[PDB]
Design a protein around this motif. Structure first.
Motif, PDB file in Angstrom:
ATOM      1  N   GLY A   1       0.776  -1.222   0.000  1.00  0.00           N
ATOM      2  CA  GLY A   1       0.000   0.000   0.000  1.00  0.00           C
ATOM      3  C   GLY A   1       0.809   1.274   0.000  1.00  0.00           C
ATOM      4  O   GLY A   1       0.279   2.325   0.382  1.00  0.00           O
TER       5      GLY A   1
ATOM      6  N   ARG B   1      -4.795   4.366  -0.315  1.00  0.00           N
ATOM      7  CA  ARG B   1      -6.017   3.914   0.344  1.00  0.00           C
ATOM      8  C   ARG B   1      -6.242   2.423   0.127  1.00  0.00           C
ATOM      9  O   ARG B   1      -6.643   1.706   1.053  1.00  0.00           O
ATOM     10  CB  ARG B   1      -7.215   4.717  -0.161  1.00  0.00           C
ATOM     11  CG  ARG B   1      -7.096   6.216   0.056  1.00  0.00           C
ATOM     12  CD  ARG B   1      -8.427   6.912  -0.171  1.00  0.00           C
ATOM     13  NE  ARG B   1      -8.257   8.278  -0.651  1.00  0.00           N
ATOM     14  CZ  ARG B   1      -9.073   9.282  -0.359  1.00  0.00           C
ATOM     15  NH1 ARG B   1     -10.133   9.108   0.414  1.00  0.00           N
ATOM     16  NH2 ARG B   1      -8.819  10.490  -0.854  1.00  0.00           N
ATOM     17  N   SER B   2      -5.991   1.938  -1.085  1.00  0.00           N
ATOM     18  CA  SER B   2      -6.125   0.526  -1.410  1.00  0.00           C
ATOM     19  C   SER B   2      -4.743  -0.102  -1.517  1.00  0.00           C
ATOM     20  O   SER B   2      -3.895   0.377  -2.278  1.00  0.00           O
ATOM     21  CB  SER B   2      -6.897   0.337  -2.717  1.00  0.00           C
ATOM     22  OG  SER B   2      -7.166  -1.033  -2.956  1.00  0.00           O
ATOM     23  N   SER B   3      -4.520  -1.172  -0.755  1.00  0.00           N
ATOM     24  CA  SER B   3      -3.230  -1.850  -0.755  1.00  0.00           C
ATOM     25  C   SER B   3      -3.053  -2.792  -1.937  1.00  0.00           C
ATOM     26  O   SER B   3      -1.942  -3.285  -2.152  1.00  0.00           O
ATOM     27  CB  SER B   3      -3.047  -2.628   0.551  1.00  0.00           C
ATOM     28  OG  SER B   3      -3.577  -3.938   0.442  1.00  0.00           O
ATOM     29  N   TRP B   4      -4.110  -3.053  -2.704  1.00  0.00           N
ATOM     30  CA  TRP B   4      -4.040  -3.947  -3.856  1.00  0.00           C
ATOM     31  C   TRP B   4      -3.749  -3.104  -5.092  1.00  0.00           C
ATOM     32  O   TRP B   4      -4.642  -2.459  -5.643  1.00  0.00           O
ATOM     33  CB  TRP B   4      -5.335  -4.736  -4.003  1.00  0.00           C
ATOM     34  CG  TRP B   4      -5.866  -5.235  -2.696  1.00  0.00           C
ATOM     35  CD1 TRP B   4      -6.859  -4.675  -1.948  1.00  0.00           C
ATOM     36  CD2 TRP B   4      -5.423  -6.390  -1.975  1.00  0.00           C
ATOM     37  NE1 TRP B   4      -7.066  -5.413  -0.808  1.00  0.00           N
ATOM     38  CE2 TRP B   4      -6.196  -6.472  -0.801  1.00  0.00           C
ATOM     39  CE3 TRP B   4      -4.448  -7.364  -2.210  1.00  0.00           C
ATOM     40  CZ2 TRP B   4      -6.026  -7.488   0.135  1.00  0.00           C
ATOM     41  CZ3 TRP B   4      -4.280  -8.372  -1.279  1.00  0.00           C
ATOM     42  CH2 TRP B   4      -5.065  -8.426  -0.121  1.00  0.00           C
TER      43      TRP B   4
ATOM     44  N   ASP C   1      -9.403  -1.964  -6.702  1.00  0.00           N
ATOM     45  CA  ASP C   1     -10.426  -1.002  -6.314  1.00  0.00           C
ATOM     46  C   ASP C   1     -11.108  -0.346  -7.510  1.00  0.00           C
ATOM     47  O   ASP C   1     -12.024   0.458  -7.310  1.00  0.00           O
ATOM     48  CB  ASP C   1      -9.821   0.074  -5.408  1.00  0.00           C
ATOM     49  CG  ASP C   1      -8.447   0.522  -5.869  1.00  0.00           C
ATOM     50  OD1 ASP C   1      -7.521  -0.315  -5.876  1.00  0.00           O
ATOM     51  OD2 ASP C   1      -8.293   1.711  -6.217  1.00  0.00           O
TER      52      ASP C   1
ATOM     53  N   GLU D   1      -9.695  10.775  -8.467  1.00  0.00           N
ATOM     54  CA  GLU D   1      -9.990   9.358  -8.274  1.00  0.00           C
ATOM     55  C   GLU D   1     -10.890   8.930  -9.430  1.00  0.00           C
ATOM     56  O   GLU D   1     -12.118   8.999  -9.335  1.00  0.00           O
ATOM     57  CB  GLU D   1     -10.647   9.105  -6.919  1.00  0.00           C
ATOM     58  CG  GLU D   1      -9.705   8.541  -5.868  1.00  0.00           C
ATOM     59  CD  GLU D   1     -10.280   8.617  -4.468  1.00  0.00           C
ATOM     60  OE1 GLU D   1     -11.445   8.208  -4.279  1.00  0.00           O
ATOM     61  OE2 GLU D   1      -9.567   9.085  -3.555  1.00  0.00           O
TER      62      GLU D   1
ATOM     63  N   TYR E   1     -10.922  -4.844 -12.706  1.00  0.00           N
ATOM     64  CA  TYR E   1      -9.683  -4.499 -12.021  1.00  0.00           C
ATOM     65  C   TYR E   1      -8.725  -3.789 -12.970  1.00  0.00           C
ATOM     66  O   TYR E   1      -8.522  -4.223 -14.107  1.00  0.00           O
ATOM     67  CB  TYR E   1      -9.027  -5.756 -11.445  1.00  0.00           C
ATOM     68  CG  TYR E   1      -8.524  -6.730 -12.488  1.00  0.00           C
ATOM     69  CD1 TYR E   1      -9.391  -7.603 -13.131  1.00  0.00           C
ATOM     70  CD2 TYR E   1      -7.178  -6.777 -12.828  1.00  0.00           C
ATOM     71  CE1 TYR E   1      -8.932  -8.491 -14.085  1.00  0.00           C
ATOM     72  CE2 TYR E   1      -6.712  -7.661 -13.778  1.00  0.00           C
ATOM     73  CZ  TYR E   1      -7.592  -8.516 -14.404  1.00  0.00           C
ATOM     74  OH  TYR E   1      -7.131  -9.398 -15.352  1.00  0.00           O
TER      75      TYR E   1
ATOM     76  N   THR F   1     -17.710   0.851  -7.015  1.00  0.00           N
ATOM     77  CA  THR F   1     -17.262   0.112  -5.840  1.00  0.00           C
ATOM     78  C   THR F   1     -16.905  -1.325  -6.200  1.00  0.00           C
ATOM     79  O   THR F   1     -17.710  -2.047  -6.788  1.00  0.00           O
ATOM     80  CB  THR F   1     -18.334   0.104  -4.735  1.00  0.00           C
ATOM     81  OG1 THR F   1     -18.854   1.428  -4.559  1.00  0.00           O
ATOM     82  CG2 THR F   1     -17.740  -0.382  -3.422  1.00  0.00           C
TER      83      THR F   1
ATOM     84  N   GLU G   1     -13.435  -3.942   2.079  1.00  0.00           N
ATOM     85  CA  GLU G   1     -12.491  -4.215   3.154  1.00  0.00           C
ATOM     86  C   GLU G   1     -13.220  -4.107   4.487  1.00  0.00           C
ATOM     87  O   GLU G   1     -13.747  -3.043   4.827  1.00  0.00           O
ATOM     88  CB  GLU G   1     -11.316  -3.239   3.101  1.00  0.00           C
ATOM     89  CG  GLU G   1     -10.143  -3.718   2.261  1.00  0.00           C
ATOM     90  CD  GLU G   1      -8.805  -3.411   2.900  1.00  0.00           C
ATOM     91  OE1 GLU G   1      -8.335  -4.225   3.720  1.00  0.00           O
ATOM     92  OE2 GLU G   1      -8.223  -2.351   2.585  1.00  0.00           O
TER      93      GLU G   1
ATOM     94  N   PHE H   1     -11.560  -9.332   3.184  1.00  0.00           N
ATOM     95  CA  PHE H   1     -11.721  -8.772   1.849  1.00  0.00           C
ATOM     96  C   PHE H   1     -12.846  -9.499   1.130  1.00  0.00           C
ATOM     97  O   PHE H   1     -12.838 -10.732   1.042  1.00  0.00           O
ATOM     98  CB  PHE H   1     -10.422  -8.880   1.048  1.00  0.00           C
ATOM     99  CG  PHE H   1      -9.183  -8.677   1.873  1.00  0.00           C
ATOM    100  CD1 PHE H   1      -8.874  -7.430   2.388  1.00  0.00           C
ATOM    101  CD2 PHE H   1      -8.327  -9.735   2.130  1.00  0.00           C
ATOM    102  CE1 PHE H   1      -7.737  -7.243   3.147  1.00  0.00           C
ATOM    103  CE2 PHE H   1      -7.187  -9.552   2.889  1.00  0.00           C
ATOM    104  CZ  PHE H   1      -6.892  -8.304   3.398  1.00  0.00           C
TER     105      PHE H   1
END
Lengths: 340, 216, 57, 230, 258
Positions: free
Chosen positions: A75, A94-97, A116, A136, A143, B51, B55, B68
């Motif tokens: 992240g 904000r998103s670790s992926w 995300d 954003e 994905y 969306t 999480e 998740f």
């Protein structure tokens, strides 16, 4: 009934195949039989990058050939100084992926994306001492897998919703939408003139797109497996493609056909990066066997091997001036390679 | 080194120091993956704790958990399932009332088999949550179970019916020796589901705690 | 349904555009790719290693 | 926006003690290195003290070493500077400057308003007659080669308009600061430096202060005033 | 004699086999500490290799003594230094092994409270405590006292009690806690609900082997200390007993770096 449309579609496909065969007269291997081979190429890790606490999934080179941006699953986005190894920035995410990361050509913005479905644009030239998220970008139902910067305001993005999109930073809306891919598009690369960009998807195909009109001109086939990496040739009239099948294929935007494949029997692993060198003679392909083999673009020969990674290599890029080559793997390490 | 060059080095060390602090916090957090099939009671289990993907963070007995909800991606599973490697456990939700609705149970079995034999999860513990048991008892009294499984030989009771479904999900693993599967039945009013997840991850913590000791 | 008919029509139209573009000989494209590598060979650090004096790494 | 307000000035008896509180608002004070620069009445600038972002590394001027102590409060976003045994030469206007590693350098981009306290690198002639619409060049010299082994020349140019805080114009003698017109430019060779202005304006009147960020020990210039012709 | 012939053969086995094993284990252990998130076990294991390495560095001093039947007579300044390092390495290995057993027990009986509680610092303190205790309890012995032989009878009135006092606190207490931690670790590894068959046996067997190595190797040399207080005479089998502890210096790396 829709079978009549299918019948004429097959006839058009036959015409395309016939046209490709007619234009094919000499293999690229045959024409380059009188060229002196490069020989052996040895590269050593001049600088190793430490600080990542998770597998690195993407990395991009800045236009200044000094600044490096790397993305990991921890992240954190880190702006690295290749010459001096220090970390310029550490942007929390904000998103670790994270599956992709981009560096703006002017260097004032950094893009990131992942599971995300949001392409976050970070302002790296803030008056304050921190880096905020400027925009954003939302609208993708799949994905994010690859995003590239046309300029400071226009950014292209390939997601898992099988559709590529052109985004406007100021308005945060999709200017153009690229549709036509059955499978999810993973990797994309912009042409040097920025007018064109290719997209590789899981449907074992690559498509040429137009930024201005958002339409597809050429569809490239020949890969027996899904496409994972694809990059443009320095000239801009060609591009190489990587796939999960252990083979690299080179296509042209004019001939619209494959010339020469880069594969070996000792290799059966996937391909994650296919980034070209500055002159286009050397083709560096990242693999899943902890190796980054060196491929001669004009002969499909093995000119060198880049080893030293303890896990799968997920990202590999060549700097703007072609001076050095950086490789990032899942072992949370980035190695910058140079000749001697 | 120049005046400004030394200042840049100090900033990197402070950046690295902050990065190390965050990693220590991350190493103390338990990661859980929710991989239910076709909305098989995802809402009820999530709301019971404490969306694109969702999480969910909750703490139970001074242990922080990260959940998740990746079932909403709607894309190629194999292209992002590798990002969940190293997860502590995988939480699986299967509704017991979907056998009477290309059956829904067979869809759950296919996705269960995909991740139980996956290379990235060759040693990850699986927590199978067979929820919606309240409607299963009522449905078994009016609809025979033989619709879903033509090979069933038992009666139309509930205790044996539940065991047969649990047994079928427990024979889909070819790596039983190295990976364990946990099964539980959760009702609407059940409140001990969080404890079972805590019990399941304690064994996983045990395995990786002695791994650093040079024992495995 | 009409969606399948429209989708099939779009694929047929798209395939026509792909075959309607001009194509060049492979050998002609081979020379252009070969010429670019030869022209820029002297300025490629990967092909020709540079001395440490001008090497930033 | 970015603001830096100082407080703690007034009349100080000789041999006493006083503290200056440079309040910080509108920027991340924790990641910003802070400098103290004082300007004597009708004189130039001189560096006093510097504190890093993490407060781990702190340097001091030779004239104020030991007597002056500096501290920062990151949670309160306030910079402190306590002084012991104030002398007659310590009366000046103290400015707090935020410095961050930016664009490969450490710009002195923002300068505080300052407070009133009462108790090598030479420049050209202090007075130069200029007129609007003409090009004026200001020269500079250094006692040591400011060029480093990395190819970076550490020169900073500052503008101090009358009745206003100094403003950074050029950093590293090659890159224009944010918010400055493209008229200003810089050049040099590591020992002799010059600043060129394309077109003069009514807002360009002031004193140009040169500065070196090579060693620590940042010595300022005497100054170059550009007064309007009669 | 035959005693010297066999005492030589065992010593060179430890030196020729331990040094490749300890150095290879040392290279692996330093990398783990350099790698992110170092567990307290590795710090104790890293100190274990250093303690074992010091014994092997002073091993060639003792091979010459057994080479020609108690020869190479050198002054007390070097003989005391050789004895100091050898005994400290033996005794530091005693507490470091006990610290490993404590960590293993804490990682199974209390796994949740062991996860978000471990810090690299705790391993350093445990290693430092073992280091100061080993050197602190060995420097008092050295100053109190072929190789050294039977001293005066009046001096033996303090040489023997300080040896057993060194043996009592610094060996039996680590031995007691090593058995105390390992007994419950082996106890709760078979009644655990969900543990693999091929992984439960390995953990129990390795713990038993580690306990056996601790008692078999470090035992006889420290047992001679208790015999000396009862039978007031320097034990005649210390030469063989110290080799058993030397076997631990070579055998311990193989238990962890394998």
């Amino acid at each position: 009934e829709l079978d009549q449309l299918r019948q004429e579609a097959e006839q058009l496909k036959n015409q395309i195949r016939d046209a490709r065969k007619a234009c094919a007269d000499a293999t690229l291997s045959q024409i380059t039989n009188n060229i002196d081979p490069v020989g052996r190429i040895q590269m050593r890790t001049r600088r190793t990058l430490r600080g990542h606490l998770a597998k690195i999934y993407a990395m991009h080179w800045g236009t200044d050939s000094r600044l490096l941006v790397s993305a990991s699953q921890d992240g954190k986005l880190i702006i690295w100084d290749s010459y001096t190894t220090n970390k310029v920035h550490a942007i929390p995410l904000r998103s670790s992926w994270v599956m992709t990361c981009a560096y703006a050509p002017s260097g004032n913005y950094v893009a990131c994306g992942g599971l995300d479905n949001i392409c976050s644009i970070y302002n790296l030239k803030t008056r304050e001492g921190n880096v905020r998220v400027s925009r954003e970008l939302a609208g993708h139902t799949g994905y994010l897998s690859c995003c590239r910067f046309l300029d400071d305001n226009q950014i292209v993005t390939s997601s898992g919703d099988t559709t590529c999109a052109l985004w406007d930073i100021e308005t945060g809306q999709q200017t153009t939408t690229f549709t036509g891919h059955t499978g999810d598009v993973m990797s994309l690369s912009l042409a040097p003139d920025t007018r064109l960009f290719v997209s590789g998807a899981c449907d074992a195909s690559a498509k040429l797109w137009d930024v201005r009109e958002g339409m597809c001109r050429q569809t490239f086939t020949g890969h027996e497996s899904d496409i994972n990496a694809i990059c443009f040739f320095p000239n801009g009239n060609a591009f190489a493609t990587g796939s999960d099948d252990a083979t690299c294929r080179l296509f042209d935007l004019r001939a619209d056909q494959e010339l020469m494949t880069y594969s070996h029997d000792n290799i059966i692993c996937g391909i994650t990066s296919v980034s070209f060198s500055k002159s286009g003679r050397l083709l560096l392909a990242g693999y899943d066997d902890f190796n980054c083999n060196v491929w001669d673009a004009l002969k499909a020969d093995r000119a060198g091997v880049l080893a030293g990674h303890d896990n799968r290599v997920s990202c590999l890029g060549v700097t703007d001036d072609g001076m050095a080559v950086a490789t990032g793997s899942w072992d949370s390490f980035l190695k910058i390679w140079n000749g001697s | 080194l120049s005046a400004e060059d030394k200042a840049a080095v100090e900033r990197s060390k402070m950046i690295d120091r902050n990065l190390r602090e965050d990693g220590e916090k991350a190493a103390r957090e338990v990661k859980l993956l929710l991989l239910g099939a076709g909305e098989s009671g995802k809402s009820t289990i999530v709301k019971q704790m404490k969306t694109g993907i969702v999480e969910t963070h909750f703490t139970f007995k001074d242990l922080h958990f990260k959940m998740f909800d990746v079932g909403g991606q709607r894309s190629e599973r194999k292209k992002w399932i590798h990002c969940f490697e190293g997860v502590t456990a995988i939480i699986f939700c299967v509704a017991l009332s979907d056998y009477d609705l290309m059956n829904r149970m067979h869809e759950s079995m296919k996705l269960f088999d995909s991740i139980c034999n996956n290379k990235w999860f060759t040693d990850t513990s699986i927590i199978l949550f067979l929820n919606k048991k309240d409607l299963f008892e009522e449905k078994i009294k009016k609809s025979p179970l033989t619709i879903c499984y033509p090979e069933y030989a038992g009666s139309n009771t509930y205790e044996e019916a539940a065991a047969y479904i649990q047994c079928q999900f427990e024979d889909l693993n070819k790596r039983k020796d190295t990976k364990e599967i946990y099964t539980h039945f959760t009702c609407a009013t059940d409140t001990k589901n969080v404890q079972f997840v805590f019990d399941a991850v304690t064994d996983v913590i045990i395995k990786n705690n002695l791994k650093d000791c040079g024992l495995f | 349904n009409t969606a399948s008919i429209a989708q099939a029509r779009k694929l047929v139209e798209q395939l026509k555009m792909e075959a309607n573009i001009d194509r060049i000989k492979v050998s002609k494209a081979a020379a252009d790719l070969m010429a670019y590598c030869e022209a820029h060979a002297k300025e490629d650090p990967l092909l020709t290693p540079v001395p440490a004096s001008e090497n930033p790494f | 926006d970015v603001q830096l307000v100082e407080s703690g000035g007034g009349l100080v008896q000789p041999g006493g003690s006083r503290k200056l509180s440079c309040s910080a608002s509108g920027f991340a004070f924790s990641s910003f290195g802070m400098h103290w620069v004082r300007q004597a009445p009708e004189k130039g600038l001189e560096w006093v003290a510097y504190i890093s972002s993490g407060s781990g590394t702190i340097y001091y001027a030779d004239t104020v070493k030991g007597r002056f102590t500096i501290s920062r409060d990151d949670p309160k976003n306030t910079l402190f500077l306590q002084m012991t045994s104030l002398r007659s030469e310590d009366t000046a206007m103290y400015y707090c400057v935020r410095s961050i590693y930016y664009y490969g350098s450490s710009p002195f981009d923002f300068w505080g308003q300052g407070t009133t306290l009462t108790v090598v690198m030479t420049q050209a002639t202090s007075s130069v007659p200029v007129t609007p619409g003409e090009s004026v060049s200001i020269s500079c010299r250094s006692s040591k080669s400011l060029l480093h082994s990395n190819g970076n020349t550490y020169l900073y140019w500052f503008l101090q308009r009358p009745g206003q805080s100094p403003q950074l114009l050029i950093y590293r003698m090659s890159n224009l600061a944010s918010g400055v017109p493209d008229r200003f430019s810089g050049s040099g060779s590591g020992t002799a430096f010059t600043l060129t202005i394309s077109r003069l304006e009514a807002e360009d009147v002031g004193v140009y202060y040169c500065m070196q960020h090579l060693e620590y020990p940042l010595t300022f210039g005497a100054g170059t005033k550009l007064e309007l012709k009669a | 004699d035959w005693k010297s012939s066999l005492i030589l053969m065992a010593y060179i086995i430890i030196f020729l086999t331990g040094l490749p094993a300890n150095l290879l284990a040392l290279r692996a252990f330093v990398g783990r500490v350099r790698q992110p998130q170092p567990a307290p076990v590795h710090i104790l294991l890293l100190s274990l290799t250093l303690a074992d390495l010091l014994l092997l560095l002073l091993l060639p001093f003792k091979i010459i003594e057994a080479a020609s039947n108690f020869r190479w007579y050198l002054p007390k300044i070097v003989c005391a230094l050789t004895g100091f390092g050898f005994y400290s390495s033996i005794y530091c290995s005693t507490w470091l092994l006990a610290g490993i057993s404590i960590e293993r027990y804490l990682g199974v009986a209390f796994p949740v409270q062991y996860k978000l509680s471990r810090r690299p610092l705790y391993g350093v303190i445990a290693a430092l405590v073992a280091w100061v205790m080993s050197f602190g309890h060995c420097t008092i012995v050295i100053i109190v006292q072929t190789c050294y032989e039977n001293f005066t009878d009046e001096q033996l009135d303090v040489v023997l009690p300080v040896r057993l006092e060194l043996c009592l606190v610094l060996f039996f207490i680590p031995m007691a806690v090593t058995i105390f931690c390992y007994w419950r670790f082996v106890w709760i590894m078979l009644t655990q609900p969900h543990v693999g068959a091929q992984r439960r046996r390995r953990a129990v067997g390795l713990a038993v082997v580690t306990l056996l190595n601790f008692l078999v190797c470090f035992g006889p040399y420290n047992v001679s200390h208790l015999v000396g207080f009862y039978q007031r005479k320097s034990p005649w089998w210390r030469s063989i007993a110290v080799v058993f502890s030397s076997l631990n210096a070579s055998l311990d790396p193989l238990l962890f770096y394998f």
